[PDB]
Amino acid sequence: EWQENKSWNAHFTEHKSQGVVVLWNENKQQGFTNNLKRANQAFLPASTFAIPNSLIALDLGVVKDEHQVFKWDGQTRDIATWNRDHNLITAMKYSVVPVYQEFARQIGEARMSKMLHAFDYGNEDISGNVDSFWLDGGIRISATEQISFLRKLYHNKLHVSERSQRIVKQAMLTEANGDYIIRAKTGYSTRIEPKIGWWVGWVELDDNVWFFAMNMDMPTSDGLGLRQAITKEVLKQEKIIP
Amino acid sequence: AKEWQENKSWNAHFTEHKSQGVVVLWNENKQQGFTNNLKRANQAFLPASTFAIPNSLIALDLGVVKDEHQVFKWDGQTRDIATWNRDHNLITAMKYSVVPVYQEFARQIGEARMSKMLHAFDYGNEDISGNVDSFWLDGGIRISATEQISFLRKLYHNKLHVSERSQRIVKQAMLTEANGDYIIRAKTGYSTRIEPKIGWWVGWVELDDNVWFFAMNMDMPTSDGLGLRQAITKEVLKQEKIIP
Ligand SMILES: *C(=O)[C@@H]([C@@H]1N=C(C(=O)O)[C@H](S[C@@H]2CN[C@H](CNS(N)(=O)=O)C2)[C@@H]1C)[C@@H](C)O
Ligand SMILES: *C(=O)[C@@H]([C@@H]1N=C(C(=O)O)[C@H](S[C@@H]2CN[C@H](CNS(N)(=O)=O)C2)[C@@H]1C)[C@@H](C)O
Ligand SMILES: [Cl-]
Ligand SMILES: [Cl-]
């Protein structure tokens, strides 16, 4: 079942914001959200598209492994961490769009369309060329749809190799300590309103996994740390992390 | 290949705690090694719970362990470490150093396959003499800090003669710490059945642009000092500007 817990709206309104958190308790097969409507509204994925793009690139051999180096093209872009050589791990850490656009061009439109359909990722009616559609609004996805996709990835159930799925889950590693492991991907959609932040992923515990997907209003880049901070406040409230 | 560099200033991090030991570092990009004590870096000890790394690789490659979700049920014997008295999988068995799970792996692998695969891994002295389910606690096997690094470099590069999948699963199980600055994959040990009683910590630090392998051991006359395995290692990594 799904349970709506409107008490989590306080974690957004404390920051003069609005958003949705969606949680899924894998052991109990139960979901929770503050806003069932916004949980099911589709937003541009922005940098969260790094997950399916990386899976497809690895499965087709566009990317050999997580050590392959994608050289900087020497064009200075306005995110400083993009202006250097990357591998699949650092490209995900720094959300390096130009690396992902070269992956997409090599995948090509036909194989990209077929794979996203196989993954049941995003809307049926995608539009835009293969290096741009995932930046310019040609694909969108909801927080509940991000959870369903991430559950398939966690269980190695996507229609790509087990190896591809294991490598991308390695690249998603964000935090680990003696209490929990978080595998996740941030996003920040700026090209089309509403400007939003994403954080999608899961928390591994000794005896359970909690999937999460959040998006929130992001009128300026000043608020970007709230993607992780508000999510962690909800996880702490629900006793998932200490 | 390149000369080991000795840095005796690291001894201060041991003597601060009235302790003695060795830290060995390997800079992968530069193919350069560093230690406070070249002699002790080459001294071979029982691996104790550091053996969980090769034991898990062999169990996965032979199909004794299907994957990292397979549950190893508690046998119902109450042991003195409370976290052992519960069901485990390959991830939690490594986190809690659950010897009874690893002893079941070793019995299913058996003496012959265990001896052959440690030979294939070039692991320490390759000697499994003793009980098939305790030789890494009180039998003949011995490995040095430098030998631990040689083994871990092969694992990092998927160069051991087991499947790539087996190597990726064990590296997942070794995950110890991750933040925006670094990832540590590592395994603790504490050898208490045979003198000298020692602590171990072996593994690597992944940075954006390099990997630093480490192997440390130290005298551990009482369980008091077990946190020094990680704390002394991190003081050295901080001194060398590897972590903040
Ligand atoms: C993905 O969604 C986009 C990228 N994701 C970004 C992110 O890191 O969240 C970056 S924005 C980057 C963050 N660090 C720089 C400075 N932040 S600050 N000090 O101004 O608050 C800017 C980028 C948008 C992808 C689609 O571009
Ligand atoms: C592996 O080498 C041995 C195991 N390694 C352990 C470890 O924690 O490093 C456990 S010892 C663990 C720590 N806390 C309990 C002991 N007392 S305390 N709270 O002071 O640390 C249990 C175990 C020895 C394996 C061969 O047994
Ligand atoms: Cl990992
Ligand atoms: Cl063990």
Numbering used by the authors:
A (entry chain A): 24 to 265
B (entry chain B): 22 to 265
Published text:
To probe the molecular basis for carbapenem selectivity, we determined the crystal structure of the K73A deacylation-deficient mutant of OXA-48 in complex with doripenem at 1.5 Å resolution. We obtained a 1.5 Å resolution data set of the OXA-48 K73A variant co-crystallized with doripenem with two OXA-48 molecules (molecule A and B) in the asymmetric unit. In molecule A, doripenem’s sulfur atom adjacent to the R2 pyrrolidine ring is in the R-configuration (Δ1R). In molecule B, the cavity resulting from this mutation was occupied, in part, by a full occupied chloride ion; in molecule A, the W157 adopts a different conformation that is made possible by the K73A cavity-introducing mutation. There is a covalent (acyl) bond between doripenem and S70. The β-lactam carbonyl oxygen occupies the nearby oxyanion hole comprised of backbone nitrogen atoms of S70 and Y211. One of the oxygens of the carboxylate moiety of doripenem is interacting with the side chain of R250 thus forming a salt bridge. The methyl moiety attached to the C1 position of the core pyrroline ring is making van der Waals interactions with the CD2 atoms of Y211 (3.8 Å distance for both doripenem molecules). The hydroxyethyl moiety is in the same orientation in both doripenem molecules; this moiety is not making direct hydrogen bonds with the protein but is making van der Waals interactions with residues Y105, V120, and L158. Despite all these caveats and uncertainties, our structural results point to an importantrole for OXA-48 residues Y211 and V120 for the poor activity of C1-methyl containing carbapenems and doripenem in particular.
